[PDB]
Amino acid sequence: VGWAESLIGLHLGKVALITGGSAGIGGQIGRLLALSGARVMLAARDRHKLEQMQAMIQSELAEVGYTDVEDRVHIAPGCDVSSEAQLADLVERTLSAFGTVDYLINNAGIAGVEEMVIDMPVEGWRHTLFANLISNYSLMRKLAPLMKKQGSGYILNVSSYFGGEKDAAIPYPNRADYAVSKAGQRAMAEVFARFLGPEIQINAIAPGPVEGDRLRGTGERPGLFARRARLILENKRLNELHAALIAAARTDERSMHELVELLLPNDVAALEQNPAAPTALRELARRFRSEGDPAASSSSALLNRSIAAKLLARLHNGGYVLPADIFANLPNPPDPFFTRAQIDREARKVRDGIMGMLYLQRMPTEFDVAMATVYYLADRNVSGETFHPSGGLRYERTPTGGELFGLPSPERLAELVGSTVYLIGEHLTEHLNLLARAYLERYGARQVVMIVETETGAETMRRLLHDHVEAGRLMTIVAGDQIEAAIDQAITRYGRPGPVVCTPFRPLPTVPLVGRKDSDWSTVLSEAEFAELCEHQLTHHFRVARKIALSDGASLALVTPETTATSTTEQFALANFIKTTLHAFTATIGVESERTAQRILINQVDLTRRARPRDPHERQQELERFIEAVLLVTAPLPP
Amino acid sequence: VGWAESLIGLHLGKVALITGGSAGIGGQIGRLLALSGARVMLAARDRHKLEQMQAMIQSELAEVGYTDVEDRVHIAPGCDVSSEAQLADLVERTLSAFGTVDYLINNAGIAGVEEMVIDMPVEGWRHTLFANLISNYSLMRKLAPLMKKQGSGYILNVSSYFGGEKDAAIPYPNRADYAVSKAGQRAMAEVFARFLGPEIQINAIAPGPVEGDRLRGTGERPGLFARRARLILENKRLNELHAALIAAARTDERSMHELVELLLPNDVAALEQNPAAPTALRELARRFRSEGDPAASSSSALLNRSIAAKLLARLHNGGYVLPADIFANLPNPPDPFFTRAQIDREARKVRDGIMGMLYLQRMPTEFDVAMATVYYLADRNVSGETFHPSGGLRYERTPTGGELFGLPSPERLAELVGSTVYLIGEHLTEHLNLLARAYLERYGARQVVMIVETETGAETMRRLLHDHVEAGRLMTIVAGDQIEAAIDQAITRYGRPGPVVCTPFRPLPTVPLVGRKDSDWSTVLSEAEFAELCEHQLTHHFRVARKIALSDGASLALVTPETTATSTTEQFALANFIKTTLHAFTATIGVESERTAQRILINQVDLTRRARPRDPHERQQELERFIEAVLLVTAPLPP
Ligand SMILES: NC(=O)c1ccc[n+]([C@@H]2O[C@H](COP(=O)([O-])OP(=O)(O)OC[C@H]3O[C@@H](n4cnc5c(N)ncnc54)[C@H](OP(=O)(O)O)[C@@H]3O)[C@@H](O)[C@H]2O)c1
Numbered sequence A, B: 001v002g003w004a005e006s007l008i009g010l011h012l013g014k015v016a017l018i019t020g021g022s023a024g025i026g027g028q029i030g031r032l033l034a035l036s037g038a039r040v041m042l043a044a045r046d047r048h049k050l051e052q053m054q055a056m057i058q059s060e061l062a063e064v065g066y067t068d069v070e071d072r073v074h075i076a077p078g079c080d081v082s083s084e085a086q087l088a089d090l091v092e093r094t095l096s097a098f099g100t101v102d103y104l105i106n107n108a109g110i111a112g113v114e115e116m117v118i119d120m121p122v123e124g125w126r127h128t129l130f131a132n133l134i135s136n137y138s139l140m141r142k143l144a145p146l147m148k149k150q151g152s153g154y155i156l157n158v159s160s161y162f163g164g165e166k167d168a169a170i171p172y173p174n175r176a177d178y179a180v181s182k183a184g185q186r187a188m189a190e191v192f193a194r195f196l197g198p199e200i201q202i203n204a205i206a207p208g209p210v211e212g213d214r215l216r217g218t219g220e221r222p223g224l225f226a227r228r229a230r231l232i233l234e235n236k237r238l239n240e241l242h243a244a245l246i247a248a249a250r251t252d253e254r255s256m257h258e259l260v261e262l263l264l265p266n267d268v269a270a271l272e273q274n275p276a277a278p279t280a281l282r283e284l285a286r287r288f289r290s291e292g293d294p295a296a297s298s299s300s301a302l303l304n305r306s307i308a309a310k311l312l313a314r315l316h317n318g319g320y321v322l323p324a325d326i327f328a329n330l331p332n333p334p335d336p337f338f339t340r341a342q343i344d345r346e347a348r349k350v351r352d353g354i355m356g357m358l359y360l361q362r363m364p365t366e367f368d369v370a371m372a373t374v375y376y377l378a379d380r381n382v383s384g385e386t387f388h389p390s391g392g393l394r395y396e397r398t399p400t401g402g403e404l405f406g407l408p409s410p411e412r413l414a415e416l417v418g419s420t421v422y423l424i425g426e427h428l429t430e431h432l433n434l435l436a437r438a439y440l441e442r443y444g445a446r447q448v449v450m451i452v453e454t455e456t457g458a459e460t461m462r463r464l465l466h467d468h469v470e471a472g473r474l475m476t477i478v479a480g481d482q483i484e485a486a487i488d489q490a491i492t493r494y495g496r497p498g499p500v501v502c503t504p505f506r507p508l509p510t511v512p513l514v515g516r517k518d519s520d521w522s523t524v525l526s527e528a529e530f531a532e533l534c535e536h537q538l539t540h541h542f543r544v545a546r547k548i549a550l551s552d553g554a555s556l557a558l559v560t561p562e563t564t565a566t567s568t569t570e571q572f573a574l575a576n577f578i579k580t581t582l583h584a585f586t587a588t589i590g591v592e593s594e595r596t597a598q599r600i601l602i603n604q605v606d607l608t609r610r611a612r613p614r615d616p617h618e619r620q621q622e623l624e625r626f627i628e629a630v631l632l633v634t635a636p637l638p639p
């Protein structure tokens, strides 16, 4: 009896659905579940790879002695998990093949946009959330009614170390969309376990780095390490150019338009020697020539067309005026822009740092991780947890949820005199009133710009703040679903902000999170409502942070939802879900912002104490602690 | 092929040592490791139970088809893990039987003292640390040199949910010694993994509540639930008596001596009707008669001899003067003091609450936990982690390591005027100087009592604080290893404290935590040095907290070790070990203190930011943040 005999019978009688099941970790989970007696459905996009994994597993089952192997491994091609229609067709296909699903393995996880937040299109961020997070809720919502009806089920989200930990965030620079989606997979397990129990287990796994094609690549496409290496070099050029232009603009009278025109020759030596160029650009050109590889055209040309478009988008998004065609006639540098020597050097440094982080100084294989996971899936007695099948890393984490604090120093508070404050929100009218009055009346801010969602919320705040509106100290802008343009309007008409307090427009929903055993679940939080929760409680803050991180001098506070004595226990859960998931965003953009030209601070203030009222005195002291917390992170630090 | 065939070969070639291996979870781990091919040594105290487990396992191995089963299961009787001499004999016995140990399963875990901190003898606390925590380091220190020499090994500490989580404490009222030992088992794994890798894995497991004799009991001895139930009733009587006497003393001119004499008739109805008794004691007697079971003598008698001795010890330890024989002639109430109906009612409430905490509303068996653990032990790719083989609980956790804070309000600071401050410490002379001067010069405290360890430390602080010593504002007491008597001296001579800041006497050691592969490890932190670390960095704070929790009006800050730019990476690790382990103490005594008559606040201030210097300005701002942090938790809250 060989190694697969430790598996025989382990999951006999189980039906498992594995997304991303045609390769990688999910391929090996589907393989090993099938060897252990489960009937499996493998879902992914490319038909050919699914058929090759299906034939490999079926062949292996027969070697072990199973009969009718065609009934034990099924495939669902064309299934992009980011498409809800496909997820509905997946469930229909799986139930018709096998009946009720016991194990939902939410394994598919796209790498995402792989850009800094400030270069990350809003739609790409949405696509990552749909593929990696919203799909996990969508499949659970479709399969959990059947699991609960039969009395048993298991939902397993494949998260990551870069989704953080129960009480600590871990930044993942250039991967904020991925990190947030990973963190949300874990938070789903932590907050939904109490509702899904006793019948249904829900846990996450969070592997450390895994040896396979995703990290290492193949003979055709570069893996995560090589892509990260080239991006290190690309973004080094973009960040250095962007930073130098911002600095040069600080002490040159020419416009950003005219400074960018100095780059049009795209000639490194000609810019170093151009006596009419500001010295920040000439020292940059000297730097490119000194540190660069003489065989790379990046060492003799400033830009390529792709980096030029990223630069222009940053300048446009940070309020500068330049024609869209400014880079149309830019000479194209001859290939290669960075050589293989540069890229491979950076790739080896990426892998060597990661191996140095691991306590064990070795990565598991995809087979190793799947094996640990398939043993873990036999444990009937744990729910709400994150299992680490590999790992142990020296990465720096940021503890979340510190409870005690006071006011900032008198020195930092005096710097608020004369400042411009942006407040963003709609639902939390009492917080918004109190904050505006604290900035204007207590700390001598010049003005507050109150950015709301609707005209009705505008009128609510104008009424609450009627005296400051009349004195011209409180301005209201109606953002709708165009918050970027509203921030542009504030900047143009009232000036750049110091403090920016970003509260959600919308409250949390008040619907059930699970259905009664014999119900149709029709009142339970729907798939589209979960996408809406993400839009209003995550994407909202991301969009504001994306713009405000280009606004020099701003200090940004991201405020997560409130829960009161009125709030249902489902609202408490969803607030804790959002807290944990957003902390992954906040920690990540914090690290990226240190590398940006712009001095901007980004912090998170949580209104829900995760504790779950006694007289309006305790109410007014809970709100006063909120004011203190916001001031603690929006008062500037005197240089 | 049956269920044990999923185990055949899983740990073939491994030698495992399981402490507490004759029953419970450790018995099942030893059983299941032996079925999976490992040779096992089972260690525990009682010879008979070890022989019965050995014969059961050997018999089962033979049923499965192993030969020479006598070579596969060995026992080590007489091994109390709290005795270092026994641990040395255990290792010698195991190496001679099997050669090198691959798996150290630190499973033995005594329940401990099972009292509130204020009723917990210092020696019992020490015994729990020796049995449950110091023994884990001791066996690792003896076995890790051989594991590292052969290139592989595994250390598994059996911790608990009530050891908390990486970044959050979980209180365990009446079990502070056990909770601290559990938390230290986890912290050992988290901080030692980077040093023990790549050759040696070290993780913890933390089961939730487990179905077996430990929780449920047997037909002879009561299990954890029944003991907890009786203790609920006993301690309810003790706490209520203690509280009423303290209150009665607040408004009666008689001494505590004379008030306690009112209890000597031990007659509930006679005290309710005694017109000479203070009303707090008469309302207590009325309460005992109203809520009590008429069949329990607790409803007609005030005390028994055991509760009387606990009461007297609390009064003596809180500074009151009473003769040791005051309860010598106390009439003994006839059995039963609490009936079976009362105790069983409380036991059912204990079990029902626990089952309601579990998301899954069911406990694993000892077999289930061992099975999950034995699968986990095959995972070669994770170190430094805590695996939860069962669990998912609704318990409230306290996040640790919040980073941002300011000063407390002006209102709380003004209440420091005229206060008496106790500072405890020796090594941290700069912190102690700065704190004393902040209390005396900035906030108008009446006086500081500086409690040091040695005459040399006394003279150091007298020199640093020479002006305040001359003005009579700074008093020094030399505690030696008698910190309780030193606190008694402060109280008698200078008055009760408001703020009490407890810093460690000793710095952290500067020795290696692991040895080079071919070394003898003789310079590595020794077994006795690890016990010393616990004495100086845990037991120190516990002893102070034990006394100060009886001092009305005190606010206690427990300060964990400092790490600077000088500090080695081993010191950084040991500081993080102590931080995590002490937070379990701080969170637990905080909950017990809410139930004590005495209004005392207990908080923890961590000097090591777990981050790992730029000019004395950053130094003076790091120390100023320490001052702010200490003030934030020692300034009283105005009523
Ligand atoms: N690799 C690591 O080091 C690591 C570490 C921690 C966590 N994880 C997590 O582990 C999970 C699996 O990772 P992996 O390394 O196995 O990734 P991978 O190798 O890139 O996954 C490949 C599989 O995912 C499928 N897939 C890709 N995009 C998809 C989409 N939009 N819809 C449906 N299926 C899709 C692929 O098939 P098609 O392309 O044909 O659709 C293929 O079946 C992920 O959730 C990842 O976040 C990985």
Ligand SMILES: NC(=O)c1ccc[n+]([C@@H]2O[C@H](COP(=O)([O-])OP(=O)(O)OC[C@H]3O[C@@H](n4cnc5c(N)ncnc54)[C@H](OP(=O)(O)O)[C@@H]3O)[C@@H](O)[C@H]2O)c1
Residues within 6 Å of the ligand: B019, B020, B021, B022, B023, B024, B025, B026, B043, B044, B045, B046, B047, B049, B079, B080, B081, B082, B106, B107, B108, B109, B110, B131, B158, B159, B160, B161, B206, B207, B208, B209, B210, B211, B212, B213, B214, B215
């Ligand atoms: N039970 C739970 O719900 C639970 C939950 C979480 C964690 N845990 C942890 O799991 C571990 C095992 O727990 P358990 O429920 O199996 O405990 P248990 O049933 O009380 O353990 C009994 C075993 O421990 C031995 N033992 C007791 N005191 C000892 C000492 N001073 N030295 C050496 N051996 C000793 C006993 O033999 P002798 O009496 O003959 O020495 C017997 O072999 C413990 O570390 C515990 O903290 C338990």
